[PDB]
Amino acid sequence: STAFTGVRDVPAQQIVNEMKVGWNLGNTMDAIGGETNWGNPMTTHAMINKIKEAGFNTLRLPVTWDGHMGAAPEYTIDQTWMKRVEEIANYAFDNDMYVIINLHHENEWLKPFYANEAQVKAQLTKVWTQIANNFKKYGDHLIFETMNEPRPVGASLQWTGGSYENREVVNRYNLTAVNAIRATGGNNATRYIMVPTLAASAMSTTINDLVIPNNDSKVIVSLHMYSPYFFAMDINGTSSWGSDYDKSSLDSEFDAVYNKFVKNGRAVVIGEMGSINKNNTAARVTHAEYYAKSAKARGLTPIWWDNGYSVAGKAETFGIFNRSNLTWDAPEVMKAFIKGIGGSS
Amino acid sequence: STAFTGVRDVPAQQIVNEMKVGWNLGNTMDAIGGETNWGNPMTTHAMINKIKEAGFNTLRLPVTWDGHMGAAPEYTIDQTWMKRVEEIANYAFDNDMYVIINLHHENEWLKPFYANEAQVKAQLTKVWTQIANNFKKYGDHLIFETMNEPRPVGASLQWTGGSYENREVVNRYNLTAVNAIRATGGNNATRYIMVPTLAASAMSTTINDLVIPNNDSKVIVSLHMYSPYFFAMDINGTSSWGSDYDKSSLDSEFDAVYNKFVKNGRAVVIGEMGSINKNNTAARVTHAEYYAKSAKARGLTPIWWDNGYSVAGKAETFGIFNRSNLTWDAPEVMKAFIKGIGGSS
Amino acid sequence: STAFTGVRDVPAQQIVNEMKVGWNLGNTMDAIGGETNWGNPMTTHAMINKIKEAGFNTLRLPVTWDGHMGAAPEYTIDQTWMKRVEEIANYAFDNDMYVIINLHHENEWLKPFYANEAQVKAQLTKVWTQIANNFKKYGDHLIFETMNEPRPVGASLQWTGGSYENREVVNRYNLTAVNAIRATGGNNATRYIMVPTLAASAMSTTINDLVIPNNDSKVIVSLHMYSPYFFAMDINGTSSWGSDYDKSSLDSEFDAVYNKFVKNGRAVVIGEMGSINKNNTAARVTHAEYYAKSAKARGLTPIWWDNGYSVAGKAETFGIFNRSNLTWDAPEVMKAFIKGIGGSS
Amino acid sequence: STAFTGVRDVPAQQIVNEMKVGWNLGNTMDAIGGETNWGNPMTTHAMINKIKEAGFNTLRLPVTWDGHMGAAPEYTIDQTWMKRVEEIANYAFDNDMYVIINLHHENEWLKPFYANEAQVKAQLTKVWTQIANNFKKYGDHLIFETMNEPRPVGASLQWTGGSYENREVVNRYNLTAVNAIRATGGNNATRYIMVPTLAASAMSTTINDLVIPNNDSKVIVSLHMYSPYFFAMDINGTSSWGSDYDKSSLDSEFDAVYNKFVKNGRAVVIGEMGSINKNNTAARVTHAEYYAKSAKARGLTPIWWDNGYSVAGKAETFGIFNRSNLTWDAPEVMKAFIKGIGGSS
Amino acid sequence: SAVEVTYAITNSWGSGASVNVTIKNNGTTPINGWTLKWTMPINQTITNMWSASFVASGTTLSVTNAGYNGTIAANGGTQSFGFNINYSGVLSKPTGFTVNGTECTVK
Amino acid sequence: SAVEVTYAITNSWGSGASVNVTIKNNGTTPINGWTLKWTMPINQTITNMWSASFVASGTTLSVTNAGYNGTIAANGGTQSFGFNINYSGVLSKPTGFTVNGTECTVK
Amino acid sequence: SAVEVTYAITNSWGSGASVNVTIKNNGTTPINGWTLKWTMPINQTITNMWSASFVASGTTLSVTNAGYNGTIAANGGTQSFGFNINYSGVLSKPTGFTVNGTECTVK
Amino acid sequence: SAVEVTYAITNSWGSGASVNVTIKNNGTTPINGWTLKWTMPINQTITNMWSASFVASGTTLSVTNAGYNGTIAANGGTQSFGFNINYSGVLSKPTGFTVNGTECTVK
Ligand SMILES: OC[C@H]1O[C@@H](O[C@H]2[C@H](O)[C@@H](O)[C@H](O[C@H]3[C@H](O)[C@@H](O)[C@H](O)O[C@@H]3CO)O[C@@H]2CO)[C@H](O)[C@@H](O)[C@@H]1O
Ligand SMILES: OC[C@H]1O[C@@H](O[C@H]2[C@H](O)[C@@H](O)[C@H](O[C@H]3[C@H](O)[C@@H](O)[C@H](O)O[C@@H]3CO)O[C@@H]2CO)[C@H](O)[C@@H](O)[C@@H]1O
Ligand SMILES: OC[C@H]1O[C@@H](O[C@H]2[C@H](O)[C@@H](O)[C@H](O[C@H]3[C@H](O)[C@@H](O)[C@H](O)O[C@@H]3CO)O[C@@H]2CO)[C@H](O)[C@@H](O)[C@@H]1O
């Protein structure tokens, strides 16, 4: 097990390298209303075994805590919920994997505005204090991600960089979250931590305004890059990918991240990416393999968003693993992604 | 007259601030086959007077020299051609304007590959030596732009950042051009010079690979940013502009340039931008004014691409000035653009 | 009291500015064999009151722990000793001062060589765990200084920058010390921490090789600058100070520090400085006032080394406060030092 | 001959590496009152041949121009003097060496004060235009050094960093000199140029305030470092050199330069250094060899100051070559210096 | 608010005045390309501005950095500009200020 | 002179006032660790100062940067600080300033 | 070419060997995120690699930097990585290399 | 050691060979101005060297960086140089190295 291997003092880039390539247990512990509320089966050790066998070395474990905690001032998190997150993490540690645990769909309380700041900070502190306390003994194969995609809600703002206000308050929240984690002491004082830009966007506005809490070298940047948008995400966007223009455009997105962070020693994880199923396997194969090798060439570790929904022709069909069958619903795509990542032997 | 006022030593950013906002004499001296061959009238002093009056302080004067020069080894530029370029520059100097003179459609000889580098450098050297010598007498209101949009040929490559080879060779050509200009001495030793990225693209790949010749502090970056593509350039793209997403996306384009260059003391001119006419005046007005003020907030000076073609509903209809009768074909778009630029009084 | 004010998230430079100017309780808790063992009386609250009243806002409390701790593996520190340190700290907190507590004459065990590294790190961890745990509740007015003047043993090496090995290992120990402190959690995870260069020397060799543990922005650099050597430290050196040369040489020493650290946002405390008594009060007055104002002009906070020994004509006579009398042995030196520091009112 | 080999676009550090190690024709063309007026014989090709044979690859040719020029506006330089300087330079090019030509003892007119700036810049411009024009055809083996040790006049200020005013104005003069050189065009637009800090001092104050004219990448910093002062330069100072402290102190002086300039890609030549004759050959041999290898380990090319005066027990006895005899007055010092430098074969 | 604006009068001459504005960023995030907006009192007109440029639109006055001073550093950083006004009646100061959308404090 | 100092009154309440000072460096060399000196009219006393500290000696006033704002960048860089004064009589302002020994232009 | 690849044998033991590769960039533009491609000689298999990762496809070997060493600086910068191979008989060396599409000189 | 030296054979021809040497710094502190010292095997002479210079004293070799490659960055940074030798007998390699006084691991 990699659960309790202690905490190294290596540069975060080395950790990101070992993380290698990851898979999200999406629409699960992040589902509003509980683990099985969004149509996934209860998660098993056998499922995670398959994820490791495929070539993934990181399990991102997104968790929505809203709905599982009491009121101010303590915001006590339900103990069964906490221990269930821990149980699933150990499925992965048994496989010698890295695990990332975050706060996910917390928009009902985590609001990046000056007017909400004081109260949100208080809640963030209590929430992270409890999570960090529960996982204190775990070594550096456990990575905390302070928040998911903190942003102003409101349809017209969905793909924007928000306001200077929002970006400033997000930076303040990341600091509050990191300090709360570190204040519990032990391995939490030295473990690696991921922090997002506003909306975890890699756009210039948000990556240029990111401030690393305490300038901490143990901090890793968290970005979500479902690129290119129309191919990867839009049920009505093109089902083709692979032209010289496509490749160059994807390279350029990564180059922005390489130049801002990676080449200056600031490590970066793409904690979510992937494509939906437009019944276009050959295109998704070309895209997945190129995404993987292009991202890896910029020092980036990509993590596939798998929400357990893989039906051809429907929106949000990012699922590639069949959890009920323990087989791959999109074997070619998965294999291509892994193949693109390469390896050291 | 900003003809022979000498060459100041101020920060390149101050020059760019003074240039303020510009207008291109497009499809004129850049037109294949001569000044009137692409449907524009012979340029007159009266035309440029109107440009100044509208509030523009910079005339970009694109010139295609291919077709007006002899064979190797001297590549002698036709005296009559050179004299005509100078005559037009002086229409602007009389108005106390900045003038940018470049090499424009030189694609037939200016090729960014290792295989061509030796030939291209010899010619580039001879061409800039002659242009620099002819214009040596003019002060810092005359700016040289070393090349237009150097890139590998091929429609499939048009919106890409080229290969590493292409970007390396473009950096080599910029060095060659700058050295050729500087070597003529006098005012050309201290003149301000614009250099482009590959394709003059603002994409991360190309701006991140730009190398400033000799780290010369008198060098200004030249980018072309017809943003956003679908609205501004694509005859089949949307006719609407002005949502929160629109504003945010454009801001972020400029933010990439601010963070890479401007905030580090490297000045930047957007030598070409604009929108075509899709019978969408109100949208174009909203876009032009927002573009101007957004760009200016990142220290950038935008220059409108005017090719003298303004027919509603056709591609490439960037023209806003009516050269035949000295009125504006798009008065409102022009006024909005200028209004967004603002002023010091 | 400033004992329990909590911990701010401001830049360390602001903390250094508020620290303002300090006084060392020298040859006391740092004395080999006990507080009174080097001729100083037992420290009283009344003594520290005089320090504050003279205008000092920081008490540096050097402590030698060797001799008050058990053997491996626990290296348990005498609890009586620990409580005594805490008690003196509270004399200063009662006066609303900053307090710095270090490890001081630890050279019998703290050896910066690869061969000793594992054992030294083990002892450093245990020692800082205990000190940090004891003071966990204290707010940001309590600063830990990880080591004093760690360096290779030997009289011939005293004023050298050691070897690369020595400097590399010092950096490793600083990280070890900082991690040990932070791992105790609470205010220890967020308090400000000072770390020395090898020998706490400001020489280029050693400041150039300093690595900040985790790049942590809460870390402050600790330097000792008894400059200029001949006048300040050497009983056989000149008794005069005040020429343009003297002023310029001193400025330049501070300029090295400003340029390497302060101007880059890395805060610096000159934790020890001062002059000996060569029956040259006027010169010392001139030196002290200029030192204070020159250091402060570079954002540096200086702390006078006061070993309680003020006898004219003898070596090591840095004492300026008379502890038995509650009066100043060198009132003019003291007053000029304070005067040079200035204030905000 | 290396006289007319044209000009490469290589990094200045490569140029400095090739210069390798140098020797000053001191108290010669820099002498007030004529080439032989300070005790040296008329320079011959034979002498220069011996310099090359010994292993030096750079001749620094200091020239005082004051005393050989008219008054404003033209400050015309005596052509006979100009050609004699050129003749000597060619003795060196015939030996395939580098040559540095400077302005040397110009203190009577070169005054670094706001009040003198306008007039001094006018003279500087006239002086460098003439020198540059005379040597315009020479390739990159000819290097110009803009000024020698510009500083405020006064014995008491000799070893200071001057005032901010002085350092600002020195930076203005360097830009004036560089612009004058570059404005003459041709090889002058691209050759490598050396510029001094105030007083050519390597102290923190002066190296920190150096501003590279136009950020020009072909500019090399010129520093004079007769270190350590007491051994190298002070007739009433120690005659011994070689302790661990001596070596560490020398290393540290070079470390300041390495860290400020060399490691950032800004190349540096120590244009003057050396030791006087205190009848201490063994010590000077130890010092000379260590100086060379330590300097070289930090990318620095050192150049020995030889004023042709080698009398033991006397001040200013830096001479090591016997010009009248074509032998070495200090064969062992010379050989150790060269041995310290090493080689590529 | 973590952003403060200081609007101060450098000099006045009965029919006009010279103003200096200092924007101070006490927040954690640099302001990359500052813009400053306020409501212009009646009876006042900006005659010229330095270190910044402006657009007057109704009673709204929008000021933009000059590029070289575009970034206001976090944790106490400042940037400053100035301008001359002509005025009549009483010389009032603007009441509100917003910087890149954020409401400022008035020092 | 290439160094300009702007001394401006932010607000005044009969018996006291608030001052903002901006120092501008138009020269080629950064000022690394700025200090500002002037002679203060006798009817005035500084009560408190921010972003800087000072030493008052009679009417001689020496102001030193606060570290984080210690460098005034070349080619138009600025740094600013402020303070409150108590005063009687007519409020005057200093008319000459030196920064690190360089006489300034008062704008 | 301005990019040079040095392929050198650190150690060999008849059935296997250890290789060190150094890529040198002599051009003017930094290579931001290097990749290196060559044709794997017959009878050779990479067993493990450090300071880089690879994808073997057919006779094609594609190597990618490890992030911290991703930028090969211009004007003579280098980055290096190494690996072990198994081989049979004659230890052959690749004859050509491509770095980000650019054909290299083998030194 | 936290410093590793890779000494590799680029090419050999029986009486001579080409060597590539890579120094890797796995410690926390950058090596600012590297020097590398070792003992050459007997019957080997260095003919020329690039990207560094040397002083040979018997079989004692002291190599110095070429300035532009003087810093070996911490946490896995490398610098490299190469040289040719003539030799007789078996092509042996050095058994240890010292970098700025620090003993290296031979990889
Ligand atoms: O059908 C089950 C429930 O699905 C909910 O929608 C989720 C999508 O299925 C899921 O793919 C998406 O994942 C997000 C991810 O959480 C976010 O971090 C990332 O930025 O974008 C991904 C793609 O959109 O999350 C959504 C939920 O927010 C339905 O909302 C729910 O009604 C439905 O029962
Ligand atoms: O393709 C040519 C156009 O490129 C534009 O720049 C793009 C950058 O190269 C690209 O890296 C960037 O990518 C963003 C992405 O837009 C955003 O959604 C994501 O979250 O982060 C990515 C990395 O920052 O997008 C920009 C804008 O499209 C030029 O600005 C444009 O002028 C040029 O023609
Ligand atoms: O109708 C006249 C001729 O037009 C030619 O095409 C040009 C467009 O009219 C012109 O607006 C466009 O301008 C370019 C600019 O030169 C380039 O630097 C920038 O990147 O993009 C602008 C928009 O594309 O240039 C094209 C010419 O290259 C027709 O080719 C010609 O047949 C026709 O007679």
Ligand SMILES: OC[C@H]1O[C@@H](O[C@H]2[C@H](O)[C@@H](O)[C@H](O[C@H]3[C@H](O)[C@@H](O)[C@H](O)O[C@@H]3CO)O[C@@H]2CO)[C@H](O)[C@@H](O)[C@@H]1O
């Ligand atoms: O008073 C008698 C004791 O003095 C001891 O030596 C100390 C000096 O008195 C003391 O002033 C000096 O302070 C050091 C400081 O600790 C160190 O951090 C700094 O670098 O230099 C200062 C000046 O040297 O420390 C020495 C002790 O190390 C004698 O050792 C002791 O025998 C004697 O009784």
Ligand SMILES: OC[C@H]1O[C@@H](O[C@H]2[C@H](O)[C@@H](O)[C@H](O[C@H]3[C@H](O)[C@@H](O)[C@H](O)O[C@@H]3CO)O[C@@H]2CO)[C@H](O)[C@@H](O)[C@@H]1O
């Ligand atoms: O030796 C310990 C003292 O060192 C002081 O720093 C020295 C620097 O390390 C050293 O590099 C520098 O050297 C200067 C030299 O003084 C100057 O004359 C010459 O022209 O350039 C050299 C390189 O810059 O001198 C400084 C000051 O002596 C520390 O500041 C001091 O605290 C320490 O005890």
Ligand SMILES: OC[C@H]1O[C@@H](O[C@H]2[C@H](O)[C@@H](O)[C@H](O[C@H]3[C@H](O)[C@@H](O)[C@H](O)O[C@@H]3CO)O[C@@H]2CO)[C@H](O)[C@@H](O)[C@@H]1O
């Ligand atoms: O030979 C007799 C003349 O000597 C003159 O003084 C010079 C010394 O002989 C010479 O060695 C010294 O060199 C300078 C060097 O020019 C300078 O750049 C460097 O910084 O310092 C060196 C000295 O340490 O220059 C002095 C001249 O300035 C006497 O002035 C002259 O009267 C006498 O006849």
